[PDB]
Design a binder for these strands. Sequence first.
RNA 1: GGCCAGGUAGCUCAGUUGGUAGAGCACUGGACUGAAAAUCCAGGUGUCGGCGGUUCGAUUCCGCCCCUGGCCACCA
Length: 425
Amino acid sequence: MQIFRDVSKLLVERVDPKILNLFRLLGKFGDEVNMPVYVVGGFVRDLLLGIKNLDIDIVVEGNALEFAEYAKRFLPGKLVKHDKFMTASLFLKGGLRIDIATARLEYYESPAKLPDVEMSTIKKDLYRRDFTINAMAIKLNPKDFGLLIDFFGGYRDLKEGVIRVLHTLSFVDDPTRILRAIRFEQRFDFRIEETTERLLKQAVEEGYLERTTGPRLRQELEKILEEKNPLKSIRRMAQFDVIKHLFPKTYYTPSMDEKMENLFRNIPWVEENFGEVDRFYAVLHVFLEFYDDESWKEVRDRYSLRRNLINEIRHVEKSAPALLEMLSERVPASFVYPLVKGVSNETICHFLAYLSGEKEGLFKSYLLKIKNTKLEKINGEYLIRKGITSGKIIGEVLEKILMKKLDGDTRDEEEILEEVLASLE
RNA sequence: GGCCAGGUAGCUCAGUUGGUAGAGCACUGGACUGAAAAUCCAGGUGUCGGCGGUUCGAUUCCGCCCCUGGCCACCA
Ligand SMILES: [Mg+2]
């Protein structure tokens, strides 16, 4: 299979001129310090796919700290060195960020061994990457500038739309990929080929998913839910039995599946009308239903979660069937008010996950009715001017006139107020 | 530097239809007992992190900061 290709034309045509000049300069610097310079990762992939990619990952063969320190004087900005893994991050004044890493054999020799055929060193660095499409590099050195370097066939997999791991232990080294793969499947329209699907299933069933830290898995989950087709992602994780390994007490049934369908269907509506909605907590709302205190404590400790989330969830699971019967009997909005009263948008999404069709339209209508229709006059300071006073009572009265206003009867103010006061006797 | 969480008495911590402060312990004495391991009934605790805003009124609703913890900052 063909390894090297010429992307130079694609480079100059597609890439932003600023980033391009940065590439040129970095390559030249590399020639000056006798270090081969590459740009690697998602940038290459997106470059082939015609997608804008801001973050740039540079891989040099040599000391990356020396290369960065060398490129700092010529490039305005702030250098942050981490001497652990020999990596540096150079923040340019333009707002761009350059990530520079070291490619070396962990033995090698000094001075730097000259270029070897097939470029073993950089190959060794690209073998550690997750998927073939992210395993490709591009040489920035002026002589070789615009050289696409693909050992593992990431180009072929890019044309055929294939998600493929590098080796059999890929999911063992970084089980987070189990999620990421799925995300990629939904990021583009791509398919996970047979072997890595087997490797994924094996990885999940062997409990490598639980070994990894919570926050990373939560991060990849959040990234998954912000992609284009969340439903297909959730169902994909369901196929691989990922959901129960992430959340032990969550069992994915056709009922829960339908809930997720309604949920993702109604999320754009809530986001439109009620504003920004966290999709992670929106999904956990359905997932974490009927969790006992122990399990909730564990799942909250693993992936850090709001301590008040379980209260909202339990509120929903408390008022859901009653809500169903309310919408079934065409009950006035005054009775549906206390349930959705002070709740978060995520809670509202959860409620919407329980219904479709006529009940959906009705609940949305009542929702928009509650969102609007707030107040005109009277309330507290004006009730001070009147017979009542001193605390809770007047607030109760407020809720009364609000309820009479939500029942469909609205004319003016003190008329409804007088009705309420007459009913207080 | 990025992200996710917390701050409630001296300590560890609960508390959402906004509506006047909560539990165990820290803390003392006595009954039984020469004394103790011990249990019994028990004597009062708050700028609810800081500050604006909405409300008659905010620990709560919201925005901006202070502080603590965790994840991450080769691969990721
Ligand atoms: Mg980067």
